[PDB]
C-alpha cells in the first residue's frame, strides 16, 4: 500500500554531442535521480537509456506516495506533481496561496533540504480496468517553469489499478516510459551555439540505446510530451500496425505537455524506427531505433485495380474567380514577370480500363489531382497493377497498410531489395498485393471505417509537393458514394520539375533572385483537394446524411483546425464545432445535410483562410421562445494590474432581458468572472432561441454560433446570410436548435459551443467578441434560474490578445511607447494572472467548467487541474487530469474540489505560464461559518466608520446583543453607510443583526442592500441568486427578531457595508458578521462537545470529593452546573491539563474563558502551551523564543480568542497555567482543522 521514494536533484554535464551513454550512473543539466537508502548514498540501478528522464513512479488506488526530494543541484529546485491530490504538500508554485509559513517550504530550496512531499492518490485519482490502462502524468519541477524544464527536470508519475504491487503480471517489460521532448539549452543561466534539441527520453537522433519490445505481446507505451514553446510532432513506427480497442487511431500524437497511453500488439521481429513524421528544416530529428526481440522464451472475393501515374496539366481555379489584379489574388492565380501562374503540370495517378493502359477515365471535376478511391473488406484478394508514364521512376506504397507484398514470387531474387523504395522505369509495369487480416472477430462496436492515402517515396518530400496522392478507404458493411477532401500545401520549390513549370510559364527567366516573397509564396499554394480561392462546389441534395472522409496530407508543417460553417460534423459519438487534423493523418467525418444555404469551408486559421484555402459547399436546393436581447458594448478594458498600463477599448457581449436596451445585466457573483466574454446562451431540447442581437461601436459586427441559417428567400438564387448588423441597428437570429445537437446519455450533462462575430474572426476575437453557448440534454434546466443548479459552472477561455491584431490598435497608441510584443496579453477570459475574480465554488458540490481556445497556431495552451483529477465520459468511462485546447473546440470539464483552500488553474506551457495563462481559484468549506467577532470585541471599535454622530452616537457600538442606554448605530439621514473595515479579506457567509430600542420607540432597518469590497475602490453589490439586478435584503422589523440570513454565493471581501433602503423613524442598528478565514479551517473541532472522550482530558491534579466534583473533563466551553470547570486538588502554579486528539491537528485559534461559582469569579491569567506525542518527551510550544504573558480576561463571562500562526502539533496538547484569580478554573475550546 504505502510507497516511499528518495528522489534527488543531480547536476550533470551533458552537451548532447556525445550520446549513447553506456557507462551511466556516474551543457549543464539538472535531472531527477533515485536512491535506495535514507542516507542517500547508493543509487538504484537505472536503465542506461533514461538519458535525461527522471525515475518512474508507480501507485494504486488509495496508495500513499512519499517523495523525499532532496535538492542536490547547485540552484533551487522543487517538486510539482500532476494529477494527484495532497494538501499543499506539492503545490510547488510561488504564488498567492495564503497558507501558513509551515506550508511555504516548496517555494525555494537551498542545497540539501531533503523535504518530504506526501500525496494520497484517492479513488477519483486511481483508475480501473475500463479506464485507461495506466495514467501517465509527469511530476515536473516548478520554481520557474521555463528554466526548470530547460534544465531537464522531468519524470513519469504513473497511477493505475490496485493489485499491481505484486510482480505477478506487472514486472513485465518494467513499463518503460517515453518522453518526446524539446529541450531548450540556449536561454538558461548556464551561459554568459546552444540550439534546441528534439529528444526521445533525452536521446537525440537514432542514438537511443535500444528500446526492447516483445515478439508477440500486447504492450503499453507511455508517451509524455515536454516543451515550453508551442509546436507539436506526430510519432510513427515504420512497420507496425496502429490499432487500439475501438479508437480508429493510426498516428500517435503529442503536444508541448500532453500524456498518452498507447497500446501496440506486436507480431514481427527486427528493428523499427520511432519517427517524427515531419520534414522540418531543423526538426524531425527526434528519431530513435526501437528493436523488437525475444524478451523471453469468410467472404473471399477477387478484385483488381488498374492505376497508372502520368503527367497532366491542372489548374486550381477552373474559373476566373480573381477580379482583383493586385491584392493577393493575381499573385497566386495569374501569370506575370515575377509569378509562376495559375495552372501547372503535375504527375498524378489515374485509372485506365484496358490492360494496355491507353483509354483514360471520364475524369470528373472537383476531384482534382487526387487518384481513384480504394476499398477493401474481409477476405479481399485485391491485386493492384501500377504503370509509370512520367519522366521519372515512380512507385506507390500505402501508409500503415495491413500487408503489402510483391506478386508472383515469394521474394524478388534480382537486384530489388524491398518494395518500399523499388522504382518503376518509364513505361514499366509492376504488380502489388495488399491484404488484410482474417481472424478479426465481429464486435458490432468496432472501428469499421478508416481513411488513409498513398503517395510516392522516390522523394516523399518532393513526391507530395509534386502531386503524388491517392485516397484509400477501409469500411465494413457486415448517392452512397462521395469524393473526399484533401487539405494540402503543394510547393513548387519542392516539386520535382519546378524548372519545367517556370520555363513553360514565365515569359522570361532572366532573374527572380530566387528570394522574392511573391514567387516563393506562389510556389507554396494552399489547396482543398486540388483547388484554391473559391473553386469548389459540393452541392448535395438535402435530407440524406453525408459521410465524408477528411484528410490533410501536404506540406502544412503545422496542425489544422478544419471547420464547417452551418453544421457540426459527427466525431466518434460527438458533434464538434471545428476539427483538427495533424498532417499525414485524417478521419471519417459523419454529417447531416438537412441545413440548406450558403456555406464555406476553411482551415479556421487566421492566415490559411486568407490564402484562398476556403472552398464553398453550396448545398442550395435539390417550446418556449427563450429570449436573449444580447448586445455589443464598448469598454475601456484593463487586462490586469500585475506587472503593468493596459487600457484598450474592447468590445463585448452583454445580455439583457427587456426590449429597451437599458440594463446591462451587471456582473454579479456567478457572472463576475466572464471578463471580456459574453453571456451564457443556455438552451434545452425543443426550446426556441429568441436572440435579438443589437450592435454598437464605430464598426459594425454581428453574431454567429455555427447554427444560424439563412431562410431560403429569393428562390432560384443563393446569397450569403447578410448578418453584418450596422451600428445602432438590431436583428433577430431566431432559430430552432435541432435534436442531433443533444449530448448523449453517456456524454456529460450539457455540451458547450462558442459564438462570435463570424464576419472577421481574426480581427474581433482579439477584440473579445466571443461567448459561450450551452446546449444541455432533456429537461434538466428547470426553475427561473435557467440552470442545472445542481452544478456550479464557470467559463474558461484561454487566448492571447494582441492589440495589433484588433481594430483598436490605432485607438491604443495613446500610451507613450514599438512592436506587438509590448501589446501581447496572455489572457484567460481577458485577465492575466492573479487578476481574475469570481471563481468561487463549493467543495461538497460537483462543478463544471467550459474550456475554450480561440486563435492562431500559438493557441496550444494546456490546462492542468492542480490537485484534482476526473473522469471523461466520451463513449465509456475513462479518466484524465491534463487537457489540451485545440482552437475552436469548446469542451466541458469537471474538477470537484475536495481539497479546500486556494489553488491554481494551471496552464502547462512554460512560455505561457510565465506569461500569465493561470490565475488563482478558491474553494471554501461549508463547515465553518463562525462569527467574525464584532460582539467578541475582536474587531475593535475604531475600525467601523460612518458619518453623522452629532449626539455622541458613534457607530463604534453597533455590535449585536449590546444593551444599555445608547447602544447602536443611529442616523436620521436616510442615506447612511456603515463600514465594517475588516482589514483582512475573508469569506463572509452571512449577516446577523437586530434593531434597537430608545426610550420606548423601536428603531431598525426594514430593507437594505450590501456592498462588499476587497480593495476599497471597486465596490460591488451582492447580485447573487439571479432573478434580479441585485438583492434587496429583508431587514428586521423588531428589536428581538430571529433573523436567519445566509448567502447562497458567499461574499469574499474585507469590507461588508450596509446600505439601508426602507426604515422606520431613524436608522439604529447593531450588526454581527458570520464568516471564516480565507482557507476555511478556523472552526471548533468539538472539545466543547463530547467529540473528545472524558478519558482523553486529564489533569495533574483534580479537585474531586463529596463537595467538589472538579473533574478535568468538566473544562468544556460554556459548561454550566455543579463545578462547571476544572479545579485541582491543590491550587499550585505547577498545574497543567492534557487533551488528547489521537493525532496531529492544525489549531490556529484557542478560546479561553473564566468561570463563576459560589458568587465569585475565577479565571487564570497566565498560561503557556506545549505539545507532546506520548507525555514523556518534553517540548513547550515555542512562542518567539519566550512564553507570552497576557493580562487576558477581565471578567468570567466573555471568552476571548487568541491566534496561533504556527499550528500546534502532536496528539497530546498541554496547557500550563501559572497564576489565577480567586481559584483555578477555565473553559477551553480550540479552532482548527486537519492538515499535514
Amino acid at each position: 500500500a504505502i510507497r516511499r521514494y528518495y528522489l534527488g536533484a543531480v547536476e550533470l554535464s551533458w552537451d548532447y554531442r556525445q550520446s549513447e551513454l553506456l557507462r551511466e550512473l556516474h551543457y549543464k543539466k539538472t535531472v531527477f535521480v533515485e536512491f535506495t537508502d535514507q542516507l542517500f548514498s547508493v543509487a538504484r540501478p537505472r536503465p542506461p537509456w533514461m538519458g535525461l528522464l527522471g525515475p518512474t513512479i508507480q501507485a494504486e488506488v488509495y496508495d500513499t506516495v512519499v517523495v523525499t526530494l532532496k535538492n542536490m543541484a547547485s540552484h533551487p529546485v522543487s517538486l510539482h506533481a500532476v494529477g494527484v491530490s495532497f494538501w499543499k504538500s506539492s503545490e510547488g508554485a510561488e504564488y498567492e496561496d495564503h497558507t501558513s509559513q509551515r506550508e511555504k517550504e516548496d517555494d525555494k530550496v537551498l542545497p540539501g533540504k531533503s523535504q518530504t512531499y506526501v500525496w494520497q492518490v484517492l479513488k477519483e485519482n486511481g483508475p480501473t480496468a475500463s479506464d485507461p490502462p495506466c495514467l501517465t502524468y509527469s511530476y515536473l519541477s516548478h520554481v520557474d517553469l521555463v528554466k526548470d524544464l530547460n534544465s531537464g527536470l522531468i519524470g513519469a508519475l504513473l497511477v493505475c489499478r490496485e493489485g499491481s504491487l505484486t510482480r505477478e503480471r506487472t514486472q513485465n517489460l518494467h513499463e518503460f516510459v517515453l518522453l518526446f521532448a524539446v529541450f531548450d539549452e540556449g536561454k538558461s543561466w548556464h551561459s554568459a551555439a546552444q540550439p534546441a534539441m528534439h529528444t526521445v527520453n533525452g536521446y537525440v537522433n537514432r542514438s537511443l540505446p535500444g528500446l526492447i519490445g516483445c515478439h508477440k505481446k500486447s504492450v503499453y507505451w507511455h508517451v509524455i510530451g515536454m516543451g515550453t514553446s508551442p509546436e507539436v510532432h506526430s510519432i510513427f513506427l515504420e512497420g507496425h500496425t496502429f490499432l487500439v480497442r475501438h479508437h480508429r487511431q493510426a498516428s500517435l500524437e503529442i503536444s508541448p505537455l500532453t500524456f498518452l497511453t498507447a497500446q501496440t500488439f506486436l507480431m514481427d521481429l527486427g528493428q523499427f524506427l520511432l519517427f517524427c513524421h515531419i520534414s522540418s528544416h531543423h526538426h524531425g530529428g527526434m528519431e530513435a531505433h526501437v528493436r523488437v526481440e525475444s524478451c523471453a522464451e469468410k467472404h473471399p472475393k477477387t478484385w483488381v485495380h488498374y492505376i497508372a501515374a502520368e503527367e497532366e496539366d491542372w489548374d486550381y481555379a477552373p474559373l476566373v474567380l480573381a477580379p482583383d489584379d493586385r491584392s493577393y489574388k493575381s499573385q497566386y492565380l495569374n501569370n506575370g514577370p515575377q509569378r509562376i501562374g495559375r495552372k501547372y503540370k503535375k504527375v498524378r495517378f489515374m485509372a485506365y480500363t484496358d490492360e494496355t493502359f491507353k483509354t483514360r477515365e471520364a475524369i470528373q471535376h472537383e476531384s482534382g489531382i487526387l487518384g481513384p478511391l480504394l476499398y477493401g473488406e474481409v477476405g479481399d484478394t485485391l491485386l493492384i497493377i501500377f504503370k509509370n508514364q512520367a519522366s521519372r521512376p515512380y512507385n506507390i506504397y500505402p501508409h500503415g497498410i495491413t500487408d503489402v507484398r510483391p506478386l508472383y514470387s515469394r521474394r524478388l531474387p534480382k537486384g530489388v531489395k524491398h518494395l518500399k523504395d523499388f522504382p518503376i522505369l518509364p513505361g514499366e509495369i509492376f504488380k502489388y498485393k495488399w491484404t488484410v487480416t482474417v481472424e478479426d472477430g465481429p464486435t458490432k462496436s468496432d472501428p469499421r471505417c478508416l481513411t488513409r492515402y498513398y503517395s510516392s517515396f522516390v522523394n516523399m518530400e518532393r513526391d507530395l509537393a509534386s502531386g503524388l496522392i491517392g485516397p484509400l478507404l477501409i469500411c465494413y458493411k457486415e448517392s452512397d458514394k462521395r469524393n473526399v477532401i484533401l487539405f494540402s500545401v503543394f510547393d513548387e520549390n519542392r516539386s520535382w520539375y519546378l524548372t519545367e513549370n517556370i520555363q513553360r510559364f514565365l515569359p522570361n527567366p532572366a532573374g527572380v533572385q530566387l528570394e522574392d516573397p511573391e514567387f516563393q509564396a506562389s510556389n507554396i499554394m494552399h489547396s482543398i483537394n486540388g483547388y484554391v480561392f473559391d473553386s469548389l462546389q459540393l452541392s448535395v441534395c438535402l435530407h440524406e446524411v453525408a459521410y465524408w472522409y477528411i484528410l490533410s496530407i501536404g506540406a502544412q508543417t503545422d496542425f489544422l483546425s478544419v471547420f464547417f460553417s452551418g453544421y457540426t460534423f459527427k466525431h466518434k459519438m460527438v458533434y464538434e464545432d471545428t476539427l483538427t487534423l495533424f498532417p499525414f493523418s485524417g478521419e471519417t467525418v459523419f454529417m447531416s445535410m438537412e441545413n440548406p444555404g450558403l456555406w464555406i469551408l476553411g482551415c479556421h486559421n487566421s492566415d490559411f483562410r486568407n490564402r484562398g484555402m476556403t472552398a464553398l459547399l453550396k448545398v442550395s436546393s435539390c417550446k418556449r421562445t427563450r429570449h436573449y436581447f444580447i448586445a455589443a458594448v464598448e469598454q475601456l478594458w484593463d487586462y490586469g494590474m500585475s506587472e503593468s498600463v493596459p487600457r484598450f477599448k474592447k468590445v463585448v457581449f452583454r445580455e439583457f432581458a427587456d426590449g429597451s436596451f437599458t440594463q446591462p445585466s451587471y456582473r454579479g457573483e456567478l457572472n463576475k468572472h466572464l471578463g471580456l466574454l459574453g453571456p451564457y446562451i443556455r438552451a434545452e431540447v425543443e426550446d426556441n432561441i429568441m436572440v435579438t442581437f443589437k450592435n454598437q461601436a464605430s464598426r459594425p459586427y454581428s453574431f454567429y454560433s455555427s447554427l444560424i441559417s439563412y431562410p431560403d428567400d429569393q428562390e432560384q438564387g443563393a446569397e450569403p446570410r447578410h448578418n453584418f448588423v450596422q451600428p445602432n441597428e438590431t436583428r433577430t437570429y431566431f432559430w430552432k436548435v435541432q435534436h442531433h445537437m443533444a449530448p448523449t446519455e453517456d456524454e456529460f450533462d450539457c455540451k458547450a459551443w462558442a459564438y462570435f462575430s463570424d464576419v472577421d474572426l481574426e480581427k474581433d476575437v482579439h477584440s473579445g467578441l466571443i461567448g459561450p453557448l450551452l446546449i444541455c440534454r432533456a429537461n434538466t434546466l428547470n426553475a427561473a434560474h435557467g440552470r442545472q443548479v445542481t452544478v456550479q459552472e464557470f467559463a474558461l477561455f484561454f487566448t492571447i490578445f494582441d492589440e495589433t491584431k484588433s481594430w483598436y490598435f490605432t485607438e491604443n497608441v495613446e500610451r507613450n511607447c514599438t512592436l506587438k510584443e509590448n501589446y501581447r496579453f496572455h489572457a484567460i477570459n481577458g485577465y492575466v494572472m492573479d487578476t481574475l475574480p469570481g471563481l468561487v465554488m463549493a467543495q461538497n458540490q460537483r462543478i463544471r467548467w467550459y474550456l475554450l481556445s480561440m486563435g492562431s497556431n500559438e493557441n496550444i495552451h494546456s490546462i492542468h487541474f492542480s490537485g484534482h483529477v476526473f473522469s471523461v465520459r466520451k463513449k465509456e468511462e475513462y479518466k484524465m487530469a491534463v487537457y489540451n485546447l485545440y482552437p475552436g473546440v469548446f469542451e466541458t470539464v469537471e474538477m470537484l474540489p475536495s481539497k479546500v483552500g486556494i489553488w491554481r488553474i494551471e496552464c502547462l506551457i512554460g512560455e505561457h505560464l510565465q506569461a500569465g495563462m493561470s490565475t488563482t481559484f478558491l474553494v471554501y468549506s461549508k463547515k465553518c461559518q463562525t462569527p467574525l467577532g464584532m460582539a467578541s470585541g475582536h474587531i475593535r471599535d475604531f475600525q467601523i466608520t460612518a458619518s453623522g454622530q452629532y449626539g455622541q452616537w458613534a457607530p463604534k457600538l453597533a455590535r449585536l446583543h449590546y444593551s444599555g442606554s445608547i447602544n447602536a448605530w443611529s442616523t436620521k439621514e436616510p442615506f447612511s453607510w456603515i463600514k465594517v473595515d475588516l482589514l483582512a479579506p475573508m469569506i463572509i457567509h452571512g449577516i446577523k443583526t437586530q434593531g434597537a430600542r430608545q426610550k420606548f420607540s423601536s428603531l431598525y432597518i426594514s430593507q437594505f442592500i450590501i456592498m462588499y469590497s476587497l480593495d476599497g475602490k471597486k465596490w460591488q453589490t451582492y447580485r447573487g441568486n439571479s432573478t434580479g439586478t441585485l438583492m434587496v435584503f429583508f431587514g428586521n422589523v423588531d428589536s428581538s427578531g430571529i433573523k436567519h440570513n445566509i448567502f447562497n454565493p458567499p461574499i469574499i471581501a474585507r469590507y461588508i457595508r450596509l446600505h439601508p433602503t426602507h426604515y422606520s423613524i431613524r436608522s439604529t442598528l447593531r450588526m454581527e458578521l458570520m464568516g471564516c478565514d480565507l482557507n476555511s479551517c478556523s472552526m471548533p473541532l468539538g472539545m466543547e462537545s463530547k467529540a473528545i472522550s472524558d478519558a482523553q482530558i486529564t489533569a495533574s491534579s483534580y479537585f474531586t470529593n463529596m463537595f467538589a466534583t472538579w473533574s478535568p473533563s468538566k473544562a468544556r466551553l460554556h459548561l454550566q452546573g455543579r463545578s462547571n470547570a476544572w479545579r485541582p486538588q491543590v491550587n499550585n502554579p505547577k498545574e497543567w491539563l492534557q487533551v488528547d486528539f489521537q493525532k496531529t491537528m492544525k489549531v490556529t485559534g484557542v478560546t479561553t474563558q473564566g468561570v463563576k461559582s459560589l458568587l465569585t469569579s475565577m479565571y487564570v491569567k497566565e498560561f503557556l502551551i506545549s505539545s507532546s506525542q506520548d507525555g514523556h518527551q518534553w517540548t513547550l510550544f515555542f512562542q518567539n523564543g519566550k512564553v507570552k504573558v497576557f493580562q487576558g480576561n477581565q471578567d468570567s463571562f466573555t471568552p476571548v480568542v487568541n491566534s496561533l500562526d504556527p499550528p500546534l502539533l502532536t496528539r497530546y496538547l498541554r496547557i500550563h497555567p501559572q497564576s489565577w484569580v480567586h481559584q483555578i478554573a477555565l473553559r477551553m475550546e480550540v479552532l482548527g482543522c486537519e492538515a499535514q
Binding site: 458619518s947 453623522g948 454622530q949 452629532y950 436620521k972 439621514e973 436616510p974 442615506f975
Partner: protein, 204 residues
C-alpha cells in the same frame, strides 16, 4: 441644521475669486451640502453638488471644499452671468431641508455723486385726498444709508413705507423711495416737510 453664510453680502469686481463660507450646527458629510445660485426676480439654479463636484455643464471656474461643520464655495473668476445670490444648503436627508442666508453677490461700483429728490403733495394730490410727501434717492453710497422722516424734532414712523430697487444687473445701481400713507389733513397740519439727508460729503 441651521445654516449661516459668511459674509452676509459681498461686492467684488467681476473676474476675481470670491469665497463664501457656510457654517452649520451638525457634523454633516460634505455630500449633503451644496450651493445654489439665484438671479434676482427669477428661479434659482444648481451650481455645485456634493460640496466638491460641479453640476451639469458648469465651467471649472467654480469649486467647493470643506466638511463636517465648515464649507466653502470658491469661484476663481466671476462674471456678471453668475453675479447672483448664492446659497449653501443641506437637502433632502434627515427628512428635513433648509437653505442658507442668501449672500447676495454685488459688483463694485465707483463712488459717484448720489441724487436726491423731494416732493410735497402737489395740488392734484391734495384734492385727491392722498397728500403723500415723498422723497427719493438714487445712485448712492452705501446701500444701507438709513434716513427717517424728521420734521421739527418729530419722528414719523409706523405709517410710512419705503421701496428699494433691486441691484442693477448692468450698472449695479440702487434706489430708495420713502412715501407717507396718510390723509390730507394729517399732512396739512404740519408746515415743514423734509426727510433727513446723510452723505459722505420747499413750501406747502
Amino acid at each position: 441644521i441651521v445654516l449661516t453664510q459668511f459674509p452676509g453680502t459681498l461686492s467684488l469686481s467681476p473676474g476675481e475669486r470670491a469665497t463664501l463660507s457656510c457654517r452649520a450646527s451638525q457634523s454633516v458629510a460634505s455630500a449633503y451640502l451644496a450651493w445654489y445660485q439665484q438671479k434676482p426676480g427669477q428661479a434659482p439654479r444648481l451650481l455645485i453638488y456634493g460640496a466638491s463636484s460641479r453640476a451639469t455643464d458648469i465651467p471649472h471656474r467654480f469649486s467647493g471644499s470643506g466638511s463636517g461643520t465648515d464649507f466653502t464655495l470658491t469661484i476663481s473668476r466671476l462674471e456678471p452671468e453668475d453675479f447672483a445670490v448664492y446659497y449653501c444648503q443641506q437637502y433632502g436627508t434627515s427628512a428635513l431641508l433648509t437653505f442658507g442666508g442668501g449672500t447676495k453677490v454685488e459688483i463694485k461700483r465707483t463712488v459717484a455723486a448720489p441724487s436726491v429728490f423731494i416732493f410735497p403733495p402737489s395740488d392734484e394730490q391734495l384734492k385727491s385726498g392722498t397728500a403723500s410727501v415723498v422723497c427719493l434717492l438714487n445712485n448712492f453710497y452705501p446701500r444701507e444709508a438709513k434716513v427717517q422722516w424728521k420734521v421739527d424734532n418729530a419722528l414719523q414712523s409706523g405709517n410710512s413705507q419705503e421701496s428699494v430697487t433691486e441691484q442693477d444687473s448692468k450698472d449695479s445701481t440702487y434706489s430708495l423711495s420713502s412715501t407717507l400713507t396718510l390723509s390730507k389733513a394729517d399732512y396739512e397740519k404740519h408746515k415743514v416737510y423734509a426727510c433727513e439727508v446723510t452723505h459722505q460729503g420747499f413750501n406747502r
